[PDB]
Amino acid sequence: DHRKIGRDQELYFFHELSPGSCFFLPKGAYIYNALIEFIRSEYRKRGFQEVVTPNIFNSRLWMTSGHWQHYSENMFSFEVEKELFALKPMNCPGHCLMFDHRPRSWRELPLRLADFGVLHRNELSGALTGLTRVRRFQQDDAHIFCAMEQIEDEIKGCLDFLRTVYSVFGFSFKLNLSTRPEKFLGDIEVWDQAEKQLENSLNEFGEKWELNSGDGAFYGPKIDIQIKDAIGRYHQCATIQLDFQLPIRFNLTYVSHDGDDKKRPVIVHRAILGSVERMIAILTENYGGKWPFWLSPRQVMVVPVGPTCDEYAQKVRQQFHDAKFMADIDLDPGCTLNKKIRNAQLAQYNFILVVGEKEKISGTVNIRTRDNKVHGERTISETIERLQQLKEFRSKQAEEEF
Amino acid sequence: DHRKIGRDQELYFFHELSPGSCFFLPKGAYIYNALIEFIRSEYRKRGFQEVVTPNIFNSRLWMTSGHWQHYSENMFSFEVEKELFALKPMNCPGHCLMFDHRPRSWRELPLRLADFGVLHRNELSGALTGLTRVRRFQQDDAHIFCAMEQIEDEIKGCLDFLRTVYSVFGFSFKLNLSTRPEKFLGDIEVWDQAEKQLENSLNEFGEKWELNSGDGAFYGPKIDIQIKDAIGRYHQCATIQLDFQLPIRFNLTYVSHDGDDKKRPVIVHRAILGSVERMIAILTENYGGKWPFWLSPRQVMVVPVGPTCDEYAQKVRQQFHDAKFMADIDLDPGCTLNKKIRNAQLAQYNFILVVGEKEKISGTVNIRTRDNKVHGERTISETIERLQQLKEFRSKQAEEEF
Ligand SMILES: C[C@@H]1C[C@H](C)C[C@H](C)[C@@H](O)CC(=O)O[C@H]([C@@H]2CCC[C@H]2C(=O)O)C/C=C/C=C(\C#N)[C@H](O)[C@@H](C)C1
Ligand SMILES: C[C@@H]1C[C@H](C)C[C@H](C)[C@@H](O)CC(=O)O[C@H]([C@@H]2CCC[C@H]2C(=O)O)C/C=C/C=C(\C#N)[C@H](O)[C@@H](C)C1
Ligand SMILES: [Zn+2]
Ligand SMILES: [Zn+2]
C-alpha cells in the first residue's frame, strides 16, 4: 500500500544495496523535512532544546549504558585502531554524557534535550518490510531530566504534546500504563512515587486509560500510546518511559534546592512520531495518497487555458513558488484543459490554478480543488495569503476550508 | 581558539568515547540548523532538490563507485549476514542510484540533487583536531546531472551561488582551475569541451583566477575556491568538480532531444561550505564569538529593572521566543541592572531589552545593543518585526542597522 503509493507518487524507494534503508526522492524528502519542522515547531513552544550528537561510539559507552549486554546483536559493530566501536541504536547515552558535561543545578530542571539523529538497528533481512521494519531511521527523540517531584508535571505536558500533534493528523489514540514488573531494578519507593505521579497525570488528562500490571520495564514504569488510523487499525507509536537506571550507570547528579549535591535526576525517554519513517508509512496508507496541504509535495498546479497565457502561468507559478509553496505548471500545448485538471487531480495536487485571458488581465486565478470544487476567481495575493494560513495552521481539510 | 570559544560560549564539546565526532549543545545546534537552513533557503531559489539517502551500503556499491579500490582505508566497514557493508564517506553513488531509478530525459536536465546526509570518514586519532579534522560531518552536498552543452551555464550558476553565500558571511575569495592530469580516464574530447566551458564561465564571471595545469582528478577537471577570513587566512571549503567516470560506472543515460537514449550526462560534485562542522569552526574563529544576529545563539537578553517587572519580562521573553528568536532572561534580584547589561554584552547577546514599570504599562521595551548603543523605546510588536527583518535578510550588522 504505502510502498506502491511511494513509487507511484515518486516519494521513496528501496534498493537491494541498502536493505532496511530508504531513498527519499525530493517529494518524500519534502514530507520528511515537513514532519521534522512540525515537531521542531512544537519543541520551540514547549521548552525542548535540540542537540546534535555523534552516530558512533566506543564499546565502553555501550558497556556502561547496558546495550553491549542486552542489545548487542541489534548493533552494527566494527573496529577502529584496535578498539571496538558501534553505530548508535539509541540517542540516550550520548545525551547522558551531555547532561554530565558540566555541573547542573535544580534551576536548570526540567532539562529537555531533543535529537533527530540517525539511528541504526540490525534487523534480520527476512523480516524487513518497507518503512515499517527498518535498519535505519530518525526518531523524534527527547529526554527529560527532572526531579522526582517534577515528574507529574512533565508527564501531563508530555500528554498535551501528543494530543496536539495527533490532533493535527486527525488521529484518535489510546493510552496504557505499564507498572513495576516482578524483576525490577532500584528502590521501590522511587517506583511508587513515580507511578503515583503517572496515575495522577493520566487521570487529570481525562482520557480512559488501561493499567497493565507488572508489564513495565525493569528500569522504569511506562506509558504507551497507540494511534488509530482512518480505517481503524492501531499502531504503537508514542511512548513515555521512565529510567532510574541510566542516571546511576552514568553517575548523573544535580544540586538540589537544599542543596545536597548527590541527588540523581529521573530520565524520561519520549517519542511521538516514533520515527519519521514509520510515521511516513502510516500516513501514506492512512491518507490514501491524499496529503493534507501542509504535508503535500504537490501543493499547486498552474495550468493555462491556451499558449497565449503560457507566460502568465509562468509568472503566477513563480510567485507561488516564491511564497514557499510546492508549485508546478502544465504547459503541454497538445493537451486539453480538462485533461490537465483531471490528471493534476489524479496526481493528488491540492490546488489547481487555471489561468486565461480574463485572469491575465485582472491579475487573478481560477481556483479549482482536488475534489474537484470551484472556489472562483481571486487575486493571486488573496490566494497566496489564504493558502499561507492554511499551511501555517496545518489544516487537514484545506480544500474545504478555503 | 574555536575550541575555547565553543566551550566558553557553551556551543560544542568533545568526548573520548567518540573521537572526531562532535557534541553540539543547544546553542551550537542552533548555529548548525541555521547554516543548513540558509543553504536550503538558497537551494529553493536556485532549483536544487533535497533528498534523503541511506547511511550504509553493500560492498558491491562501493566496488561500483570505486571507493572500495580507492577510499577503503578511510571507510568504516563491518559485516552483516556474511556480507560486507560500509558507512558512506560520500553521498554520490546513492544519488547515482536515484538518477538511475527511472528513465529520464533532456527535459529533466539539469537535475540538481542536494544532500545533507551524515558522512563518516576514518581519520587517524593523531590527525584529529576539533571541528577542522573530523571523522563525522554533514556536507552541504549537491550533484548536478546535466548535458555537456549545459555545463558552462551551470558552472556560472555555481559561481553565482558561491558569490551569494560568501557575501552574506562577508568573505572574499580566490578561484583556481585544475585541468587534466597526466594519468587520466575518459575521452580527451569530452575533457576538452568541459575545460573549454569551464574557462569560458570563469572568464564571464569576471574575477581573477589561477591556472593549475594537470592538477585535476583522474575522473574530471575542477574549480577549487578558497575563502579569506577577517584575519587574512585562507581556507579550502568550496569545490566544483566534474565527473565523467561516475556516469560510466553506474551506466547513467538520458533521452536526448534528438531521440538518442544512449547519451550519458556529466556529474557535477559541488559543495559551498564543505562541512557544516568545518564552516562552524571557521566562523567561530572569524567572528571571535561575536555572531551576526541571524547566526547568533544568543539573540535577546531580557532584563527586568526590579522584581515588580519580573512578570512582564517573562512575557516579553516568551513572545520573542515564540517569534522564533533565541531569547534568554536575567532575573537575579541580587545583581544590578548595569552588570546584567555589561555581562550580557560580554556574553555577546546582540540585543538587550531592559524592562521597567514604564515599559510594563506601555507594552514596550528599552533597546540596548551589544556595542552599548541605545535604540530607545519600542513596542514588542515593532521590535519583533524589525528583528525579524534583520534575521530574514541575514544582515551583517544588525545592531547598527536597527
Ligand atoms: C540498553 C537497554 C536495552 C533495553 C532492554 C531494550 C528493550 C528492548 C527496551 O527496553 C527498549 C526500549 O523500550 O527503549 C525505549 C525507546 C524509547 C522510545 C522508543 C523505544 C525504542 O527506542 O525502541 C526507551 C528506553 C531507553 C532505555 C535505555 C537506554 N539507554 C535503558 O536504560 C537501557 C537499559 C535499555
Ligand atoms: C572513489 C574516488 C575516490 C577519489 C580518488 C578520492 C580523492 C581523494 C578525491 O578526489 C576525492 C574528492 O575529490 O571528492 C570530491 C568531493 C566533492 C566535494 C568535496 C570532496 C570531498 O568530499 O572530499 C568530489 C568527488 C567525488 C568523486 C567520486 C565519487 N564518487 C569519484 O567518481 C570517485 C572516483 C572518487
Ligand atoms: Zn531514549
Ligand atoms: Zn560528490
Numbering used by the authors:
A (entry chain B), B (entry chain A): 322 to 723
Q: From the publication, what sentences describe this entry?
A:
ThrRS is one of the 20 (in general) aminoacyl-tRNA synthetases (AARSs) that are essential enzymes responsible for charging corresponding amino acids to their cognate tRNAs and providing the correct substrates for high-fidelity protein synthesis. BN occupies a significant fraction of the total volume of the ThrRS enzymatic pocket, physically excluding all three of the physiological substrates of ThrRS, namely L-threonine (L-Thr), ATP and tRNA. Although occupying the canonical active site cavity, BN also extends into a fourth ‘orthogonal’ pocket.
To elucidate the species-independent, full-spectrum inhibitory mechanism of BN, we co-crystallized a fragment of human ThrRS containing the essential catalytic domain and anticodon-binding domain (residues 322–723) with BN and determined the structure to a resolution of 2.6 Å. As a typical class II AARS21, human ThrRS forms a dimer through the catalytic domain, with each subunit binding one molecule of BN. The plane of the 18-membered ring in BN fits perpendicularly to the seven-stranded β-sheet of the catalytic domain. Notably, the carboxyl acid group on BN precludes a key interaction in aminoacylation by forming a bifurcated salt-bridge with R442. By interacting with the guanidine group of R442, BN prevents R442 binding to L-Thr and ATP, thereby blocking the formation of the threonyl-adenylate (Thr-AMP). In our structures, a major feature of the BN-induced conformational change is a 14° rotation of the α helix comprised by residues 431–448 that produce a 10-Å displacement of the preceding loop. This structural change is observed in both the human and E. coli ThrRS–BN complexes.
